[PDB]
């Protein structure tokens, strides 16, 4: 269960970084990269994560499917969005909100996608 696994890994995890009075979590599907029950990307039955694309353009939205919870090879579905910023954010908003797929991560995913796109755009002078 999510709560049981959280009680196991809330302080004993290989993704846990505790430094400078701060704590962080580096598991793959953690929006905001914080050590928290809500944002942990491993313990939940459904998770969403946003990563940069393989090439430095676009985002990859990965969601956890319902069926293969114990089958990590097919438990995640990754879709690449390479549109403009507004269209990309609208697509992520629709994936989280319309599906009712973890609506408490909607703004976290939107903000992370905005950060990734803003990093991907070319630097200025």
């Amino acid at each position: 269960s999510a709560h049981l696994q959280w009680m196991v890994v809330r302080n004993c995890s290989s993704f846990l970084i505790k430094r400078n009075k701060q704590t962080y979590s580096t598991e793959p599907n953690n929006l905001k990269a914080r050590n928290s029950f809500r944002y942990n990307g491993l313990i939940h039955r459904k998770t969403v994560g946003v990563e940069p694309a393989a090439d430095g353009k676009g985002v990859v939205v990965v969601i956890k499917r319902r069926s293969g919870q114990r089958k990590p090879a097919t438990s995640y579905v990754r879709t690449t969005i390479n549109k403009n910023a507004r269209a990309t954010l609208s697509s992520i908003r629709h994936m989280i909100r319309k599906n009712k797929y973890r609506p408490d991560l909607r703004m976290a995913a939107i903000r992370r996608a905005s950060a990734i796109l803003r990093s991907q755009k070319p630097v200025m002078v």
Binding site: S1, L4, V8, C12, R70
Partner: protein
């Protein structure tokens, strides 16, 4: 969950499923108890020790 035991497929040496299934042994639904595991590990890691003086 504890009373429900799925069927785990057995994988061939080539990595794909062999079509055979084993019911999940009940030991995998046992209480996960990290404090007991830590205590037992702590006290049994002292048993392979070698004296110094």
């Amino acid at each position: 969950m504890a009373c429900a035991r799925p069927l785990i497929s057995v994988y061939s040496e080539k990595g794909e499923s062999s079509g055979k299934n084993v019911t999940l042994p009940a030991v995998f639904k046992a209480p996960i108890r990290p404090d007991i595991v830590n205590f037992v590990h702590t006290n049994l890691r002292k048993n392979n020790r070698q004296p110094y003086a």
